[PDB]
Amino acid sequence: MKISVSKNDLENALRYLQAFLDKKDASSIASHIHLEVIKEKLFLKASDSDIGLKSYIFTQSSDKEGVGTINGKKFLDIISCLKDSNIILETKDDSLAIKQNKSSFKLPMFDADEFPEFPVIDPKVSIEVNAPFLVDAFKKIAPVIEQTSHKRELAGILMQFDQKHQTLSVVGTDTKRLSYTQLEKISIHSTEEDISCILPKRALLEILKLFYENFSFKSDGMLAVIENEMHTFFTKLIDGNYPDYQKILPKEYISSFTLGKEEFKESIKLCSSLSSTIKLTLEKNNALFESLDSEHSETAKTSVEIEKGLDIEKAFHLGVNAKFFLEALNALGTTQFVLRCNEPSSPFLIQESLDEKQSHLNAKISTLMMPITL
Amino acid sequence: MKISVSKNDLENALRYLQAFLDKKDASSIASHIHLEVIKEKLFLKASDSDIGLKSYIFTQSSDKEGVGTINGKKFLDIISCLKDSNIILETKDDSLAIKQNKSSFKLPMFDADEFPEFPVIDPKVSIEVNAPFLVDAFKKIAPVIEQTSHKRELAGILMQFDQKHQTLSVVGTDTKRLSYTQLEKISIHSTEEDISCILPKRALLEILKLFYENFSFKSDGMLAVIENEMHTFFTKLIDGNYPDYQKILPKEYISSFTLGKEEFKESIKLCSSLSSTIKLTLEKNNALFESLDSEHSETAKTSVEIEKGLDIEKAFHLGVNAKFFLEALNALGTTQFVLRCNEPSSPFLIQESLDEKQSHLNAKISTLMMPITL
Ligand SMILES: C[C@H](C(=O)O)c1ccc2c(c1)[nH]c1ccc(Cl)cc12
Ligand SMILES: C[C@H](C(=O)O)c1ccc2c(c1)[nH]c1ccc(Cl)cc12
């Protein structure tokens, strides 16, 4: 191989690749990036049985095509220390030479055949994502999912496609809260009417770094492959039977309250200075907040006026987990929210104000949460 | 006690105080700040046998004078969550009440008599620091000092006062490098012609957060007390016999080279991507840099043109520790530096370009460093 490339193009590609390297043992090919120069592109890949990324940059010049490997961390550390002007990469046996005016480096290459082949699938489902709504869903639902969950299928996000009705339902839960959205009018191409994919949390986080809009999502029910102009990503899927989220959602709610999002955030954060759980009291024209699990001589209280009166007689009391309630608020796009309740001992819902209205470049995420007793 | 205070004044004071609290065991008075309201001031202190801080803020109103205590971390966490408008602090038995419009808190106070008395000294030496030169010295020399040094007197910075000659010499070493400056024309008030104070590294770091200029420094040879308008700080001194730094500095240097500071930083950083130590080669019109301790198939090289020729025949070679050499450069205020050498196996000096010229609001820090053999 012998090429010249743009310093900034190469730095960028390498930063994205760092997440897919096992960097600690530099002696192992798991710390290296595979390189391949073909027809005016440098392809760079790092991969695994269960997750991987392939990218390319255009070569400024390309003189010798072929393949090789290089330690990814060291490569990125060298290139980040050079000026913003072309870099020459050239093999010299089982070594890669890096050159930029007076600065020169040599790093060892490993056998390129030891690199795992980058997998390709025959898709059973596919979509073109032309707007940010899916990543928006991903980002808003991610905090409810535990990556190190000892329960296998909850350690990822559900994507549930309905070809019939052109919907993609997206769901996360950790058993204490469950956040979901149903995306409308998605042109789904599928060999099945209804198909489901559970994506590991770790892949979800990597997707949020790589993709925003204008990408394809394709799955064979075993791997998902996500692709845009410069990147191909893949992940193993989690093995299956995601819980029936539809069965767990309440059918109706005794009470529905429209409440101020930012005033509830500030009030909850304030009380959480001394407690992880809060007693919320709703009256007609007031919301009161009190630390609940505080140490017994430590107390935080606040309140907020509700100008447009709630439909309450006396007072409804609800124990909440502060962090979870805030995360539910953080996932909302509106200035107000709706809190839907049944008994104080049963799960309650948090959603956007006017949640039926249809929005094209944002998802609308609802959260069901289990209350704290008392 | 019952006062009202400014939210921002109180937040600031509390942040500075966090460093002097043992925060993990909330049940111990070592996690609390002592409070005392006298004559339109709230005094806040946190202290130890060996280090401490006392601050004050003005009260907006003061109704009941007295004393109390409060958990410092919790207090700061509450106040950081309130609006930028007055806060009422009021005792209610062995509890402190905090109130701001609709928001109210209670925290437990401990017995104020269990708080250690804040020490006062009869000074043997004293100065008024009216400019940033001393903190500038502190900041530039601090990186060479190991706080967890198993050698007692090297775990701090030397301050060596000469009443006769109105100088304050300031020195740090970790045995591999030694950085020093001698500050001129300091009005020293002392009962001795020559006196020395070794300040612990930990106190040095706290001083850099609290003080800049317009402060007094006073010592009895056992504690140092540093004071400005709003703060009194103290520290135990380290017990003594700081090494004779003057004896360890070479008398003359065979070679002195004026070299480019920023070009040497970039070159060293670049080579340090693969190695902690570097081979520097100086020729007449070039400086060459090569990684030295790199893994044997990994190599970094660069060079820089020296336009105004050095006074060299063939080439001088010097092994350096990259991190130390950079820290020595970082401590300099000029665009160029002077590198003074004897044999490549002996210590070499790094100083500012034109180091004799006298500068009033910056210190000039020189660094002696032991080379790496080969
Ligand atoms: C079936 C699955 C499981 O038990 O792991 C499951 C997962 C999440 C929930 C649940 C049951 N039952 C629930 C009730 C309320 C909420 Cl917020 C979440 C859940
Ligand atoms: C006396 C003291 C010690 O041995 O601990 C000491 C401390 C620092 C140095 C030294 C001797 N001899 C040296 C030679 C060079 C340098 Cl940079 C520092 C030192």
Numbering used by the authors:
A (entry chain A), B (entry chain A): 2 to 375
Question: What does the primary publication say about this deposited structure?
Answer:
All of the five molecules showed competitive binding with ligase and three of them were co-crystallized and determined the complex structure with Hpβ-clamp to show that they bind to the ligase binding site/protein-protein interaction site. In case of (S)-carprofen, Thr154 of Ecβ-clamp makes H-bond with the ligand along with other hydrophobic contacts however in H. pylori the contact between β-clamp and ligand is favored by only hydrophobic interactions. Five of these interactions are common in both, which includes residues Lys151, Thr175, Pro243, Ile248, Met370 in Hpβ-clamp and Arg152, Gly174, Pro242, Val247, Met362 in Ecβ-clamp. Hpβ-clamp residue Thr173 form hydrogen bond with every docked inhibitor, while residue Lys247 hydrogen bonded the docked inhibitors (S)-carprofen. Out of five shortlisted drug molecules 6-Nitroindazole (C2), (S)-Carprofen (C3), and 5-Nitroindole (C4) displayed poor inhibitory activity on the growth of H. pylori, which may have been due to their inability to diffuse into the pathogen.
Among them one such target is β-clamp. β-clamp, a part of DNA pol III holoenzyme is very crucial protein as it is involved in myriads of steps during DNA replication. It is the key protein that increases the processivity of many important enzymes and complexes by interacting with them. β-clamp prevents the polymerase from dissociating, while polymerase’s rapid movement along the DNA molecule. Biological active form of β-clamp is dimer and each monomeric unit consists of three domains, where the protein-binding site resides in between domain II and III. This interaction site is divided into two subsites and all β-clamp interacting partners bind to these subsites.
